[PDB]
Amino acid sequence: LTKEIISEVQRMTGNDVCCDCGAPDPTWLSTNLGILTCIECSGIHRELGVHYSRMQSLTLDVLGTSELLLAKNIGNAGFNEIMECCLPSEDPVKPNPGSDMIARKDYITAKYMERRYARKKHADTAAKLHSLCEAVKTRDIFGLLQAYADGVDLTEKIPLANGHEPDETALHLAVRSVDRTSLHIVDFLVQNSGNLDKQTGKGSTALHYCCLTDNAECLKLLLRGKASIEIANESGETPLDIAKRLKHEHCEELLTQALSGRFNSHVHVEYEWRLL
Ligand SMILES: [Zn+2]
């Protein structure tokens, strides 16, 4: 299963060269970005910290299918189309397979931390948030990626007109609007948001939302991201309380596992991998 998704990921057009230096056959995956790098560039990404890039060997390490949602939907070509859109013209800034560590470090820092080569699309804040909102509603992963390239705050409230509760973020919206074909939209937000605990005007966190609709797959992504299970909504309920009350067994079992400090390592989720 995971092996079949990995071979698919490796065969994606553009995934045959390291995202950052061109080295052939990259095998290191940045799970929150859906891209593949050579081992050398991989070493620099590790230094950036999990708030920027979470590395794992695609062919050597054991992975939960949930960690391949982004790899399956993004890929080097698509990612670089946005992140290297403004790479210098007559100034060969991008490292090549023979480049030293100092050179990869300077480029990788500028590319990912500074976003020096990304296409800055939107005319700031207001626009950025609106595009993020639309990207989620249309389930467009590259639209989410662009918002992230523009440096949008993924945890900020979005200009949503008919939200379920006031002050929803893109994560609240994503959780209640994605399905088996679009879990990766929720995943992108979970792996690139520093705070998965934002609350609606009624104190609801994305976890609460998951329990209200018995969305166990989104719930699994959130727990993997260590969203806090003890935050209560304005009525005093925690997500576990909601799950019990509505009798949503799967959600109850998952939250109870987490509550007892025994939650899953390699998190698998039901998704339309389309590997037939
Ligand atoms: Zn490389």
UniProtKB/Swiss-Prot annotation:
Changing residue 46 to K: Reduces Arf-GAP mediated stimulation of GTP hydrolysis more than 10000-fold. Changing residue 61 to A: Reduces Arf-GAP mediated stimulation of GTP hydrolysis 1000-fold. ANK repeats lie at residues 166-198, 202-234. It comes from the Eukaryota. Changing residue 60 to A: Reduces Arf-GAP mediated stimulation of GTP hydrolysis 100-fold and abolishes Arf-GAP mediated stimulation of GTP hydrolysis. Changing residue 39 to A: Reduces Arf-GAP mediated stimulation of GTP hydrolysis 100-fold and abolishes Arf-GAP mediated stimulation of GTP hydrolysis. Phosphorylated on tyrosine residues by SRC and PTK2B. Signal peptide: none annotated. It is found in: Cytoplasm; Golgi apparatus, Golgi stack membrane; Cell membrane. Residues 3-125 form the Arf-GAP domain. The conserved Arg-46 in the Arf-GAP domain probably becomes part of the active site of bound small GTPases and is necessary for GTP hydrolysis. Activates the small GTPases ARF1, ARF5 and ARF6. Regulates the formation of post-Golgi vesicles and modulates constitutive secretion. Modulates phagocytosis mediated by Fc gamma receptor and ARF6. Modulates PXN recruitment to focal contacts and cell migration. Binds PXN, ARF1, ARF5, ARF6, PTK2B and SRC. This is Arf-GAP with SH3 domain, ANK repeat and PH domain-containing protein 2. It comes from Mus musculus (Mouse). The chain holds residues 422 to 697 of 958 of the full protein.
